[PDB]
Symmetry: C3
Subunit: 256 residues, 3 copies
């Protein structure tokens, strides 16, 4: 909504002066409502429009505000205790609910309220942060991480130990995006708003950040920030002029 957006926006500018104590009823109710929409996948931080990914800045503002209006609470672990201000997405789920939503949650996988998980999805022990969106039939392997506002497409395989970087600030920047049917090999990391295009295959040990050189062995071209669809990517190195040493890089070995 609009008044919803207005409320979020005005409050955001006053963020520094807001406390769980002083917050006004309208702000509060506004933020809470937006979080619920993110959680149910009604709204989403980034989306694909006319072949392009666009970010809803105000949605980023709502998530940030949520950190200001909520106070840290003691959370009862069993053998231990926690202390945080973001609630667990499944704290109140029941058998009926789980059945309806159609995904699996293997202990001790944990998800923050404010993240959406689609049907046919399997969460092995892992972590899903607030504002993330995980689409249908995706498999999240052991010890993987889906950071804030991250967008995970359909039929994605995030192998074990895989990290998907979160992106809140700057507000302008798109989150990290993994398109449909992508395969991400174990121990790989995709962060900082890098976009991995549809049907791509990333092998093990591949680290992709905004500064990673993506060498196209075919063209001899270097790309940054994005992995073209159908790419087959592996780790490698690029030599120095004198060849006395070489530096890490990702290589597109083949295009499907």
């Amino acid at each position: 909504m609009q008044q919803l957006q207005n409320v979020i926006e005005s409050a955001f500018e006053r963020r520094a002066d807001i406390t769980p104590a002083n917050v006004d009823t309208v702000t509060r109710e506004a933020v809470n409502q937006v979080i619920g929409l993110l959680d149910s996948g009604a709204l989403r931080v980034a989306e694909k429009i006319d072949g392009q990914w666009v970010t809803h800045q105000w949605l980023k503002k709502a998530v940030l505000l949520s950190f200001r209006i909520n106070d840290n609470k003691v959370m009862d672990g069993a053998e231990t205790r926690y202390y945080d201000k973001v609630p667990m997405k499944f704290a109140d789920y029941d058998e009926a609910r789980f059945q309806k939503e159609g995904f699996r949650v293997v202990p001790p996988a944990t998800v923050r309220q404010g993240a959406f998980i689609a049907r046919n999805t399997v969460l092995m022990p892992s972590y899903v942060n607030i504002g993330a969106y995980v689409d249908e039939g995706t498999m999240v392997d052991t010890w993987a991480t889906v950071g804030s506002c991250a967008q995970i497409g359909k039929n994605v395989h995030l192998s074990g130990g895989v990290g998907i970087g979160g992106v809140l600030e700057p507000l302008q920047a798109n989150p990290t995006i993994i398109e449909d049917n992508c395969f991400i090999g174990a121990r790989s990391e995709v962060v900082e708003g890098v976009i991995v295009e549809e049907g791509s295959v990333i092998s093990m040990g591949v680290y992709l950040g905004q500064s990673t050189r993506i060498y196209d062995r075919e063209t001899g071209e270097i790309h940054y920030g994005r992995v073209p669809a159908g790419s087959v990517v592996v780790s490698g190195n690029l030599p120095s002029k004198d060849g006395s040493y070489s530096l890490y890089c990702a290589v597109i070995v083949k295009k499907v």
Copy 2:
């Protein structure tokens, strides 16, 4: 073999079986096999005449357990889960723990159907179904022992190490880490690769079926297997025109 026949029969008809229609006998057979796997009486792969052999039927049993069981809500304390594979230590008492001989550091988790041997230390980590972890082994923080994987005695699995599970293909052998091997932090060993006894793998080594393993000594290239006593480190091999280089594992010394 009754047990085995029952498993094999059911498998052929997996498609038509459900947690509802499955018959008394099949259910019992499967539960029974899972229990044997859980206690180490049976194992997915074993050494025979010096070579690793895989028992497909055991894989079938595991796969069948997924089909006859239903997802259930599991109460975490702060959260809730929903899965069909029970926890191995849910009914354990002190007596049992004491008898079994290993340590489980919170929040380490193990799925029922996996064998943990005495003198083993599990730091926070995950051990999946059908795995076998032998004596005096150390599993560090955030490591993973995948399905059906075989870990020998006195093995050290450093932090963040992943050992790839292999259910299917049925015929594929699981990932095996032989006795007395050392695996460095952040290494990954997957797809049925076999790491021979007494090997030392350093940090950041990724071994899968297509990983070239370069013997700097002889200049050969091995695949799917690390010969006993090898010291392996991460490296790269150059392109024909030297404009770039690709990832590889290098054998720098054989102890």
Copy 3:
């Protein structure tokens, strides 16, 4: 305290949870509570130099000897270990007073100090560790045994900071103030990352890792000079037939 510990250490083999003497148990318990609260620390900076207090390492090792394994109730599961949970008895007020955050399911062992303004995302902090003010620990990161983490340090996701109990001589892994460690990187075996350094992703630093200074052609071992900007690389073999991993300092801030 120190004298008792050293004395007890010498007789370590004669000590078990079954017969540990009164004085020895008391002292070890006291020392662990001191580490836990930051009153003592394994390694400290004195006159520009990091010094290791072996007697503290000795105290930790004894704690393991004098204590028995106990069943620990998990909700859906059970555990069996001999080191207690730091936060098991915490209450709101304590958490409030201490001023740090613990995101489920991050876990901390008793004997580890966590300072004010710290944020622990799901991670693990082993015994004897020291985590200074305003540090951020990301998801699936590990702060190993006796490790010293400075103020305003950012430990990225999946980062492992290696523990160092034994050898007793060895100083623990040290991460100075204002350091940034990139995702999936690993610093172990007592390597010292000096203040203000930036480590990119997938960098593995051990005592044997060659830390190549592209500018000077110098190679460091076990230490990252202050203000370094480090990335992964490789050094070619004499012939040029293959190359081997290394860390490269590409610039100094």
